[model samples]
Target: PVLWKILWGLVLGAVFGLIAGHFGYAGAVKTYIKPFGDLFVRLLKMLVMPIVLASLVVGAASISPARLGRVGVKIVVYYLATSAMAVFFGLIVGRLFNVGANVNLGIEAQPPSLVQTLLNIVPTNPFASLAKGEVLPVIFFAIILGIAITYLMNRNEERVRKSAETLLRVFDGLAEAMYLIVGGVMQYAPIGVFALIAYVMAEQGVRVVGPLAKVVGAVYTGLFLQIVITYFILLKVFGIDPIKFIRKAKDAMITAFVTRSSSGTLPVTMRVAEEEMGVDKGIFSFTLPLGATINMDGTALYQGVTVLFVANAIGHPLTLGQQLVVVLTAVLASIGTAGVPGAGAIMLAMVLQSVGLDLTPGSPVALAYAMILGIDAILDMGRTMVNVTGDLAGTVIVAKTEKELDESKWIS
Candidate 1:
């Protein structure tokens, strides 16, 4: 139901915008329709700090330091490695598609120093970071605070332990509340998508259409490659049958694709991980949820592709070093990508700004952003499916390594 509504919104916006552009009524869309789109983007942006702060605090605190030992290391390392690779592929595919090649943003380049970029991740004043909407620093503070909560919770002092537990709970509640808000905001998505896309089409007309298709194609191509190459290789290395693996994993994958919510697809993924794929409940229980939160291979890849897409569209394509900075930023940002729809767009905005793209209202970068958001649902579906697939693959490999996989069940 939601999917179809978004499609209709996309179609309506494009058709209507094209008509407006043709009749030289672009000003009308700019004045009236664009604000609604701006409102939608603002609402999504509004969720970023709270969601990242609460979700990361809750997420980091949930993993006991005990779990962060061997097993945790395996999953985190595997997830990060694959996510990094996924982004690399996304960059390559984005280049192949030549997305946004026709349009040039002509923004000046201000190459950011990698060392300074790393240094800036830690905020001197956490409050100021929050006030200014500094994403990287906010993430750093949230994770450090979460780790402190976990450490205090493990203390021998009863009062300190209890207080730490309470703090974690508060953030957990905040995360849950934020999700409810996310659900409500998504209900407004079709209208938001309509206005944003309509505004783009109204102003840019046919120029918007071609690059739109290119980005869509580039995302799916990256997804296909991630699964066929990266995932297939991962499965084979662990001696799992790719054909059989996919057959068992299809239910969860389809659920993820349709729902476009990694957390929402958790139950199905857990069921497949344990029952069909023969991953032990002990491993799947711990890993799948964490994977939902932090293992965003699809989201990472999409960012990689879109970073290039936006860069090319604006006529300031990133140098190889700058693109690597994009990789680093996307990987770090993926830690807080949250397992929900529309979150990727927020991260894309962050990545664009990281590379010096101007995202101020009515800027070329903002217009390019609207163009991407219009087709986000289509992009989201494919990426979510790949994300879930990566989750199961990681679970299976980790289980096999720990001898938690049921060999007979897997063979059968």
Candidate 2:
């Protein structure tokens, strides 16, 4: 019932956005109808910190630190491997399709330093990261905080052992409260996503949709291949029926697609990961949050394709080394990158700059990028789905390896 309701919302909102945008009603939609969407995203953002802090910290505390480290390595390795593959696949498509050539535009990109990006993950001030809504550093603090709590519980120090029970007790209480908040918010997700999609559609309209059709086509082709081909293989490896998994995961995937955010869809992701797929929440909580931030199969892949497209547009042939740099940089920069829409453009700027293709004003890379940037929201939608798919897929695969999967639930 909820599925059909959500489906109807998606369809009606899309159609309405198109109609309104085409008929000079765009201003009205933005002025009035769009606030509903903005409010919904704000509601979602409001719960993000609590949900992440509570769940991730609680999830980590469930496992021994040794087990957490092993699981963490697997998650990171799997995410990086898949992201690298995606980038390679994207490059293949871009070269084959030959999408961006000489269409110039009026924008520029200045990606943050990769060093700073990595360093910031440690959070010089944890509260500042939380206040600013920086999920990565917040997660960094939660995970290690979880580990520290583990220390508190098992320490030989009497002082440490004394109040450990009280501390963890408090965390458990907080976590239980956060869980309810997440559940309540999800009841409104269909409505939220409906407006969110409508706003994005209205903003995009049909104006910028046509010019970069070829580039859009290429990115989507790579996204399709990644989700379809890789997911099927992964499902089979885990002995999961692809059909059952998809049915179970439909809401999460739909949430990801419509919201275009892995973190924004975290509540849905955790529910499905725990209830339907039967991964321990202990695993899914950490993995989903980490994947949402660090994992960028979709973004890395799209960046790979865009770099090639930019090369084509500027008539500059990338050396084999430069292509390799694109793959490496895309993977590294992808860490701590937000899974939200349009975030990839900033990361893509990193890939571009690695090969001397920063899209500053009057720069050659700026021209074709100007072309791509216009339609990034469209490309973002496809790639965001791919990113979410990869996140869920990896969760299951690692769950299987950790022997944390509930095969009985999965069969259902």
Q: Which candidate's TM-score is highest?
A: 2
Cα lDDT listed for each candidate: 0.74, 0.75
- Backbone clash count, each prediction separately: 2, 0
Residue 75 Cα positional deviation in candidate 1, in Å, after optimal superposition: 1.0
Instruction: Give the alpha carbon lDDT tens digit for every residue of 39-110 in model 1.
Output: 766665666567657766775565554543566789888897788778778878888887787574563344
Best by lDDT: 2
Per-residue lDDT value at 32 in model 2: 79
Give model 1 RMSD, 1 decimal. 8.9
> What value of lDDT does candidate 1 attain over all alpha carbons?
0.74
> Ten residues in a row with the worst lDDT in model 1?
104-113
State the lDDT of candidate 2 residue by residue for 225-258, as single tens digits.
8877777677787687777777777777777777
Off by more than 4 A, model 2:
101-120, 148-162, 208-211, 318-324, 350-354, 357-365
